[PDB]
Design a protein around this ligand. Structure first.
Ligand code: CHL
Ligand code: CLA
Ligand code: CLA
Ligand code: CLA
Ligand code: CLA
Ligand code: CLA
Ligand code: CLA
Ligand code: CLA
Ligand code: CLA
Ligand SMILES: CCCCCCCCCCCCO[C@H]1O[C@H](CO)[C@@H](O[C@H]2O[C@H](CO)[C@@H](O)[C@H](O)[C@H]2O)[C@H](O)[C@H]1O
Ligand code: SF4
Ligand code: SF4
Lengths: 124, 184, 80, 37, 144
């Protein structure tokens, strides 16, 4: 069969993945979308603020960077939505279905924008 | 047991719950005619769709700092005078609406120009239909609030909210309604 | 699926059948040549278009010809 | 009468360079992936 | 000769495994199974890479595409003088048998086969492309 390896087949690694929102079955797709969106949205603000074109402005740097992070989350939400449209047109987990993914994309937008807003509040 | 607008109310016969946003709220029995119901259902969306854009526009214009009030904007002067705005609007807006009706008759669904349904991104689903009307109904009710609050308060929507936020118990409808001459 | 045709100049050497790496061709009885056998292409849906059969045909011009056509998972030789 | 407003580029450049391409790509991606009945 | 029936419980060669094996296609579209009898335990080369030891007696392997099965068949026949046969297996559980289609390897002429895609003319006697134009689809003169 496939080449066995500790990275591919280890107990500690398997348990960690099984607890991630993507693999945690039994949770509504919308809730998983919010949990995933919040984590990525919070991180997405970092690089824009520190290395953006308006990084050296004292107060505008925080606003401009976070506002660009919010924009990228919006674009990503569109990518999630159209992916579901193309992939699911006609199985065990509700997420991998036309109904499930549409809820998942909506949750990501709500969670992602909340994370970007929450990141801004931390700064000011 | 589908929820109803009034707890303990049995939905009437003419409301079967099929249409998106159905809650059994037809006390006056207007939708009892199937032919009229199909027209009304589409008519509800378009009134709501215009409302949703209008509410966003009023809020967008206010937040961005557009100084003229959303009700005084008509009197304002632009590069193109009213001598040309109305003729263009009638010609352009007529074509969109004339073709909208033609498509609705043939297919029965909403659309844009020659696209019926107009769903480029393939987001259409039974869930999205409910989300559309409920946001649409909210905008319709919200817009009337903008119009009524303009008369009572003569203030922009957010300005009214900020005034309400400033003093919660004060700046309520009682102040503006009772002290109407002052706010005018 | 590709198109594979056997023409009446075949001498029944069997080299095309041996060369084929997907068992697309086979030999069948015939009376039009000394060997009394002719090449056949019954399983062209498995053909990938390598043209190893044409490389192996001694006759001039070729007696087996491959015309690349519509692509698919089998004809595109994919294992994924 | 013809002269557009001085703010036209501010709206149309982002609109035709960032917004319409996004909708166009989404429209095309969904279209090509769509399966026949 | 009758069509053999595949035995899914047939033992497989001694192989550690590799990254060149089956992919998600096997679980959704199809895969291929090759079986043969071994006179003695011997080392052979896997078409997917590496070396495997064939057990004495029946052996069974699974491959991702037909060419891989027929590549191993050539190795077993030419060097080890064995007589392998392989199938096409679908995810629904159906099993299709092929090679040898009629029990005799195609290189050897056998009575009962029906000629297919045989043109009783030369390559130089095909019609011109203009005469097969607007036939509803791109058609070569050889097709007609
Ligand atoms: C969508 C419909 C629509 C609505 C609800 C309004 C509503 C209004 N317009 Mg507007 N307009 C509308 C379309 C249009 N207006 C105008 C052009 C004007 C002008 C020129 C004026 C108004 C004015 C007014 C106000 C009249 C109040 C009154 O006396 O009663 C009110 C806020 C008046 C205003 O500003 O009152 C304060 C005014 O002078 N509108 C145009 C461009 C051709 C329109 C095009 O659709
Ligand atoms: C280009 C890379 C990059 C950059 C420039 C930033 C920048 C920032 N990150 Mg981020 N971060 C990144 C990638 C990056 N991050 C990645 C790849 C991860 C791993 C997923 C994280 C995980 C992370 C965490 C967990 C936190 C930050 C935080 C921060 C802030 C640290 C401020 C300081 O001075 O210390 C700042 C906005 C901190 C923050 O935002 O505090 C409010 C914070 O808590 N970052
Ligand atoms: C790879 C090459 C590269 C790099 C590193 C940069 C870097 C930068 N560019 Mg430049 N740029 C590049 C190529 C690059 N550019 C090219 C090819 C062009 C021409 C098209 C430009 C044109 C350009 C412009 C026009 C501008 C920049 C700007 C910037 C700055 C901000 C970029 C930003 O907001 O990123 C946002 C970053 C992210 C969203 C994330 C980045 C990736 C993260 C850090 C990956 C982390 C992975 C992590 C470690 C994995 C963990 C796994 C674990 C959990 C298991 C920054 C200094 C801007 C500026 O003002 O510069 C001063 C700016 O205006 N660039
Ligand atoms: C353009 C306005 C409009 C239209 C045409 C409709 C049409 C419809 N609605 Mg909807 N609705 C609207 C606005 C509208 N609605 C608004 C703003 C709300 C939120 C307050 C709702 C909340 C709502 C619910 C909860 C339900 C409906 C339902 C219905 C159906 C009822 C049957 C029928 O034939 O009604 C025909 C109706 C008309 C032709 C309306 C004519 C104009 C009226 C008489 C004016 C009333 C003015 C009012 C008293 C003053 C303003 C109040 C405002 C400020 C709050 C039908 C599809 C039911 C359904 O099953 O839908 C699928 C249902 O359950 N609607
Ligand atoms: C319901 C639709 C609607 C309508 C009828 C109007 C109407 C108007 N808007 Mg508004 N607007 C809307 C939606 C709408 N808006 C939305 C959804 C937004 C958010 C993006 C805005 C954001 C907005 C701004 C930022 C401004 C207006 C302005 C205007 C005025 C000039 C329009 C013009 O010259 O366009 C030109 C048309 C093209 C270039 C095409 C006019 C009163 C301007 C004004 O001065 O208002 C008083 C102004 O500054 N609007
Ligand atoms: C949030 C409100 C909302 C929602 C959930 C929907 C949902 C739907 N609409 Mg509707 N629509 C709306 C508002 C909405 N619409 C408005 C305001 C208009 C007028 C501009 C229209 C005009 C319209 C037409 C002409 C058609 C639809 C149709 C559809 C379907 C496919 C598109 C879709 O899923 O969009 C999902 C929407 C979103 C994810 C939200 C987008 C938010 C935008 C980008 C913000 C804009 C801000 C502004 C510029 C400032 C679906 C049932 C089609 C249909 O019924 O097919 C059967 C159809 O033909 N809609
Ligand atoms: C989405 C609905 C909504 C919301 C959130 C608000 C919010 C506000 N309104 Mg407005 N208002 C609305 C709708 C709304 N209004 C409508 C539909 C009307 C017309 C009847 C008004 C008429 C109105 C006046 C005259 C005044 C306000 C004012 C206010 C402020 C203080 C609270 C108040 O007076 O409430 C009063 C609101 C209501 C009695 C209606 C609430 C919404 C209902 C429940 C909708 C559904 C009705 C029915 C079931 C269909 C506040 C910012 C005051 C202000 O400007 O303060 C600065 C003020 O003077 N509103
Ligand atoms: C094929 C002809 C053509 C080409 C190559 C361009 C190219 C350009 N135009 Mg121009 N434009 C054209 C015809 C053309 N235009 C026509 C016929 C009109 C009259 C309606 C305009 C009105 C127009 C405006 C108002 C603006 C541009 C602008 C631009 C620039 C950015 C793209 C943009 O925003 O387009 C926008 C294009 C349109 C609104 C009209 C497109 C019409 C077709 C049928 C679709 C770019 C240099 C922008 C600029 O100058 O930025 C600095 C800008 O603001 N164009
Ligand atoms: C015509 C196309 C176009 C346009 C209009 C822009 C515009 C911009 N680019 Mg560039 N870019 C383009 C093509 C374009 N780009 C292409 C093709 C590439 C790849 C080669 C890049 C690669 C690139 C990089 C790598 C960077 C830029 C950046 C920028 C910004 C530079 C100015 C600044 O200081 O912004 C400051 C920005 C702000 C103060 C915020 C503006 C608004 C944000 C981005 C979105 C807000 C969305 C809103 C909240 C919600 C949705 C609204 C919507 C539905 C209407 C600006 C937003 C820089 C930047 O800062 O990006 C974020 C940057 O680092 N671009
Ligand atoms: C169905 C569709 C209905 C119509 C929808 C319209 C959506 C809104 C479009 C708004 C476009 C921008 O329009 C708005 O730009 C400027 C806002 O300060 C104003 O422009 C004016 O003021 C500017 C700021 O001082 C100056 O730089 C301009 O020279 C001056 O003309 C325009 O007079 C106003 O109309
Ligand atoms: S097609 Fe060519 S190689 Fe094949 S049997 Fe005929 S002559 Fe021999
Ligand atoms: S092209 Fe390749 S696969 Fe097809 S018949 Fe010739 S040798 Fe066989």
């Amino acid at each position: 069969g496939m080449l066995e390896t500790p990275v591919t087949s280890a107990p500690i690694v398997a348990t960690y993945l099984s607890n991630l929102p993507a693999y945690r079955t039994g949770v509504a797709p919308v809730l998983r979308g919010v949990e995933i969106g919040l984590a990525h949205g919070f991180l997405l603000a970092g690089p824009f603020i520190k290395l953006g074109p308006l990084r050296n402005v004292p107060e505008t740097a925080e606003i401009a960077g976070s506002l660009s992070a919010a924009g990228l989350v919006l674009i990503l939400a569109l990518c999630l939505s159209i992916y579901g449209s193309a992939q699911f047109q006609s199985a065990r987990d509700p997420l991998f279905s036309a109904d499930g993914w549409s809820e998942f994309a909506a949750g990501f937008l709500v969670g992602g924008e909340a994370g970007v807003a929450w990141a801004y509040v931390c700064t000011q | 047991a589908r929820p109803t607008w009034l707890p303990g109310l049995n939905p009437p016969a003419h409301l079967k719950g099929a249409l998106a946003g159905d809650n059994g709220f037809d006390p006056l029995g207007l939708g009892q005619d199937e032919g009229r119901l199909k027209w009304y259902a589409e008519a509800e969306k378009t009134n709501g769709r215009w409302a949703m854009m209008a509410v966003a526009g009023i809020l967008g214009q206010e937040l961005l700092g557009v100084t003229p009030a959303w009700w005084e904007a008509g009197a304002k002067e632009y590069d193109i005078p009213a001598q040309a705005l109305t003729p263009i609007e009638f010609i352009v807006m007529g074509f969109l609406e004339i073709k909208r009706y033609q498509g609705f008759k043939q297919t029965g669904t909403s659309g844009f120009i020659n696209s019926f349904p107009f769903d480029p991104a393939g987001m259409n689903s039974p869930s999205m239909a409910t989300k559309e009307v409920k946001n649409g109904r909210l905008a319709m009710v919200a817009f009337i609030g903008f119009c009524v609050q303009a008369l009572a308060t003569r203030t922009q929507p957010i300005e009214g909210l900020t005034a309400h936020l400033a003093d919660p118990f004060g700046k309520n409808i009682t102040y503006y309604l009772t002290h109407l001459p002052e706010t005018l | 699926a590709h198109i594979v045709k056997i023409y009446d100049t075949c001498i029944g050497c069997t080299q095309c059948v041996r060369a084929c790496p997907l068992d697309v061709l086979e030999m069948v009885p015939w009376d039009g040549c000394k060997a009394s056998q002719m090449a056949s292409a019954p399983r062209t849906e498995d053909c990938v278009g390598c043209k190893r059969c044409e490389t192996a045909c001694p006759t001039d011009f070729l007696s087996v010809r491959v015309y690349l056509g519509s692509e698919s998972t089998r004809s595109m030789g994919l294992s994924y | 009468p013809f002269v557009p407003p001085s703010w036209a580029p501010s709206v149309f450049v982002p609109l035709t360079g960032l917004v319409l391409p996004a909708i166009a790509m989404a429209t095309l991606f969904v279209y090509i992936e769509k399966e026949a009945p | 000769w009758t069509v053999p029936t595949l035995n899914p419980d047939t033992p497989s060669p001694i192989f550690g495994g590799s990254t060149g094996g089956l992919l998600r296609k096997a679980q959704t579209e199809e895969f291929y199974v090759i079986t043969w009898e071994a006179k003695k335990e011997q080392i052979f080369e896997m078409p997917t890479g590496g070396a495997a030891i064939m057990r004495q007696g029946p052996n069974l392997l699974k491959f991702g595409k037909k060419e891989q099965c027929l590549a191993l068949t050539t190795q077993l026949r030419n060097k080890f003088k064995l007589t392998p046969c392989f199938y096409r297996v679908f995810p629904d559980g159906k099993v299709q048998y092929l090679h040898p289609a009629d029990g005799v390897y195609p290189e050897k002429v056998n009575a009962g086969r029906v000629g297919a895609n045989q043109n009783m003319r030369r390559i130089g006697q095909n019609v011109n492309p203009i005469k097969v134009k607007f036939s509803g689809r791109m058609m070569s003169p050889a097709e007609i």
